[PDB]
Amino acid sequence: TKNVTVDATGEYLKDNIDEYPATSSECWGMFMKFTDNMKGKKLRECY
Amino acid sequence: REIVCVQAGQCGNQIGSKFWEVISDEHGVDPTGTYQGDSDLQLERINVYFDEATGGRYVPRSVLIDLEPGTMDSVRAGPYGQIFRPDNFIFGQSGAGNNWAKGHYTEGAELIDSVLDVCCKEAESCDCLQGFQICHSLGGGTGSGMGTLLISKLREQYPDRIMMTFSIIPSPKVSDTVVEPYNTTLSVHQLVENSDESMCIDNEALYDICFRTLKLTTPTFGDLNHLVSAVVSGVTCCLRFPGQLNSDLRKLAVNLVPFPRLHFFMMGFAPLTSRGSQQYRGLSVPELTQQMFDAKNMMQAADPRHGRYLTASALFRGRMSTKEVDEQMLNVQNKNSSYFIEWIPNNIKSSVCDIPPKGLKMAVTFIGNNTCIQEMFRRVGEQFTLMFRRKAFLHWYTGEGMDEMEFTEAESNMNDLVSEYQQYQDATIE
Amino acid sequence: REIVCVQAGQCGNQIGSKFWEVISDEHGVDPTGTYQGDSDLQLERINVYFDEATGGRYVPRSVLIDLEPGTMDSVRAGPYGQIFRPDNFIFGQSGAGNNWAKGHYTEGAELIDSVLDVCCKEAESCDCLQGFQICHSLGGGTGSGMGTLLISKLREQYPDRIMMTFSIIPSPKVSDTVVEPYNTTLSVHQLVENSDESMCIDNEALYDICFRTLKLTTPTFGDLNHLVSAVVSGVTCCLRFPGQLNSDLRKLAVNLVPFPRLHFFMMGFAPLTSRGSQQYRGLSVPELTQQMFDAKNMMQAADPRHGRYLTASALFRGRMSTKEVDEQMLNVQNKNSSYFIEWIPNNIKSSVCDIPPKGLKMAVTFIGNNTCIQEMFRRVGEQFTLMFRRKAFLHWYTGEGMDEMEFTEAESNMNDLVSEYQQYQDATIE
Amino acid sequence: LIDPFGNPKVRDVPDLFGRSRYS
Amino acid sequence: DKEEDTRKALEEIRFHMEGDFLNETETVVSELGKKVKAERYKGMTEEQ
Amino acid sequence: REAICIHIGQAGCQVGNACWELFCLEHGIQPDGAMPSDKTIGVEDDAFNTFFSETGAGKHVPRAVFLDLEPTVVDEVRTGTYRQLFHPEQLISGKEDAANNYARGHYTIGKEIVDLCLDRIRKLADNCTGLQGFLVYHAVGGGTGSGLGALLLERLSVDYGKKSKLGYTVYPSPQVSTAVVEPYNSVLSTHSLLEHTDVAAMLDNEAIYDLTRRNLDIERPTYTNLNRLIGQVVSSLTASLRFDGALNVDLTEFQTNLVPYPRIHFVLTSYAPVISAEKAYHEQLSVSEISNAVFEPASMMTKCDPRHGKYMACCLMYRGDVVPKDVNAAVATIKTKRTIQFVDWSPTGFKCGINYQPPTVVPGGDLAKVQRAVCMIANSTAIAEVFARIDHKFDLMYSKRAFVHWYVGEGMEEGEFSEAREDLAALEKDYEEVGAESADMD
Amino acid sequence: REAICIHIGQAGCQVGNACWELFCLEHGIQPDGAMPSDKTIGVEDDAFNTFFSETGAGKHVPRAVFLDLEPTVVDEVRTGTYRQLFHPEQLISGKEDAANNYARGHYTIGKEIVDLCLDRIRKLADNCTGLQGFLVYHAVGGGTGSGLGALLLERLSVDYGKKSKLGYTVYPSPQVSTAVVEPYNSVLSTHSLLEHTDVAAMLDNEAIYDLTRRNLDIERPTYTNLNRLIGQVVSSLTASLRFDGALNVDLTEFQTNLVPYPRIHFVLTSYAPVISAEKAYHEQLSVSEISNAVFEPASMMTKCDPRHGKYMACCLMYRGDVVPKDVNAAVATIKTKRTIQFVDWSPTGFKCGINYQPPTVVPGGDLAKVQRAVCMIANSTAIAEVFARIDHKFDLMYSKRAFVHWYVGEGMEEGEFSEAREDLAALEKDYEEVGAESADMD
Amino acid sequence: DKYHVCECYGHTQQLPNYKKLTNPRTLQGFYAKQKVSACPCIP
Ligand SMILES: Nc1nc2c(ncn2[C@@H]2O[C@H](COP(=O)(O)OP(=O)(O)OP(=O)(O)O)[C@@H](O)[C@H]2O)c(=O)[nH]1
Ligand SMILES: Nc1nc2c(ncn2[C@@H]2O[C@H](COP(=O)(O)OP(=O)(O)OP(=O)(O)O)[C@@H](O)[C@H]2O)c(=O)[nH]1
Ligand SMILES: Nc1nc2c(ncn2[C@@H]2O[C@H](COP(=O)(O)OP(=O)(O)O)[C@@H](O)[C@H]2O)c(=O)[nH]1
Ligand SMILES: Nc1nc2c(ncn2[C@@H]2O[C@H](COP(=O)(O)OP(=O)(O)O)[C@@H](O)[C@H]2O)c(=O)[nH]1
Ligand SMILES: [Mg+2]
Ligand SMILES: [Mg+2]
Ligand SMILES: [Zn+2]
Ligand SMILES: [Zn+2]
SS (H, E, C) G270-322: EECCCCCHHHHCCCCCCHHHHHHHHCCHHHECCCCCHHHCCEEEEEEEEEECC
DSSP single-letter state for residue C236:
T
CA distances from B107 to A4, A28, B99, B113, B144 (A): 52, 22, 11, 11, 13
CA distances from G304 to C256, F23, G171, G273, G394 (A): 59, 43, 12, 20, 19
User: What are residue C292's phi and psi, to 5 degrees?
Assistant: -65, -40
Q: What is the resolution of this structure in A?
A: 2.8
Residue closest to B221 by CA, chosen among F351, F248, A26, D12: D12
Closest approach atom of ligand 3 to CA B66: 21
Ligand nearest the Cα of residue F153 is: 7
Q: Could you tell me how many helices (H) and strands (E) chain H has, helices first? A: 1, 0
Nearest CA, atom 12, ligand 1: F142
* Cβ contact, residue pair G283, F126, below 8 Å: no
Q: Could you tell me how many helices (H) and strands (E) chain D has, helices first? A: 0, 0
Q: Are B381 and B417 in contact (CB under 8 A)?
A: no
CA distances from B260 to B167, B197, B264, C16 (A): 18, 9, 10, 65
Residue closest to C264 by CA, chosen among C196, C204, C343, C313: C196
* Cβ contact, residue pair A18, D22, below 8 Å: yes
3-state SS, residue F267: strand
Nearest CA, atom 13, ligand 3: B140
Is chain H touching chain E, with at least 3 CB–CB pairs below 8 Å? no
* Cβ contact, residue pair F157, H15, below 8 Å: no
| G253 is an active site residue | yes
CA distance G315 to chain C (A): 9
Residue closest to B115 by CA, chosen among B145, B141, B139: B145
CA distance G131 to chain C (A): 10
d(CA G49, CA G53): 6
CA distances from F71 to F75, F79, F92, F93, G279 (A): 6, 12, 9, 5, 21
Q: Are E33 and C79 in contact (CB under 8 A)?
A: yes
Residue closest to G51 by CA, chosen among G151, G124, G114, G147: G124
* Ordered DSSP codes for B207-266: HHIIIIII--SS--HHHHHHHHHHHHHHHTHHHHS--SB---HHHHHHHH-SSTT--EEE
Does F144 sit in the ligand 1 pocket, CB within 6 Å? yes
Technique of determination: cryo-EM
* Ordered DSSP codes for C184-205: HHHHHHHHHHH-SEEEEEEHHH
> Any CB–CB contact under 8 A between E44 and chain G?
yes
Q: Are B292 and B355 in contact (CB under 8 A)?
A: no
Q: Are F7 and F222 in contact (CB under 8 A)?
A: no
User: What are residue G136's phi and psi, to 5 degrees?
Assistant: -125, 130
Residue in C with minimal Cα distance to E6: C282
Does F143 sit in the ligand 1 pocket, CB within 6 Å? yes
Q: What is the 3-state secondary structure (H, E, C) of F347-377?
A: CCCEEEEEECCCCCCCCCCCCCCCCEEEEEE
User: What are residue F169's phi and psi, to 5 degrees?
Assistant: -130, 130
Residues G253, G289, G385, G428: which is the catalytic one?
G253
* Cβ contact, residue pair F416, H9, below 8 Å: yes
* Cβ contact, residue pair B178, F248, below 8 Å: no
Does C307 sit in the ligand 4 pocket, CB within 6 Å? no
Q: Are F332 and B174 in contact (CB under 8 A)?
A: yes
CA distances from F136 to F4, F317, F386 (A): 9, 21, 21
CA distances from C245 to B229, C40, C314, E13 (A): 52, 21, 12, 28
Residue closest to B198 by CA, chosen among B138, B141, B150: B138
Does C176 sit in the ligand 4 pocket, CB within 6 Å? yes
* Beta-bridge partner residues of F317: F353, F375
> Any CB–CB contact under 8 A between B57 and chain E?
no
Residue F197 CA to ligand 7 centre (angstroms): 10
CA distances from B152 to C22, F6, G87 (A): 48, 45, 84
Helices G383-398 and G415-434 pack at an angle, to 10 degrees, of 150
* B70 interaction partners in chain F (CB closer than 8 Å): 248
CA distance D6 to chain B (A): 6
CA angle, F130 as apex, F127 and F132 as ends, to 5°?
110
Selected for mutation to probe chain C from B87, B91, B127, B157 (highest C CB count within 10 Å) is B87
Q: Give the number of C-alpha atoms closer than 13 A to the C-alpha of residue C353, restricted to the C-beta side.
A: 23
| Probe residue for ligand 3, chosen from F240, F247, F254 as the CB with the greatest number of ligand atoms within 8 Å | F247
3-state SS, residue G232: helix
* Beta-bridge partner residues of G94: none
Strands in F165-170's sheet, in edge-to-edge order, are F91-93, F64-68, F4-8, F134-139, F165-170, F199-203, F266-271, F372-380, F311-320, F350-355, F245-247
Ligand nearest the Cα of residue F18 is: 1
d(CA B231, CA B233): 5
Does F141 sit in the ligand 1 pocket, CB within 6 Å? yes
Is chain G touching chain B, with at least 3 CB–CB pairs below 8 Å? no
* Beta-bridge partner residues of B298: B268
User: Which residues are within 8 A (CB) of B134 and not within 5 positions of it... i.e. 6 or more apart?
Assistant: B5, B6, B7, B8, B12, B147, B150, B151, B163, B164, B165, B166
d(CA F145, CA F7): 9
User: What are residue C32's phi and psi, to 5 degrees?
Assistant: -80, -10
Helices C142-157 and C180-194 pack at an angle, to 10 degrees, of 10
* H2 interaction partners in chain F (CB closer than 8 Å): 426, 429-430
d(CA F256, CA F132): 14
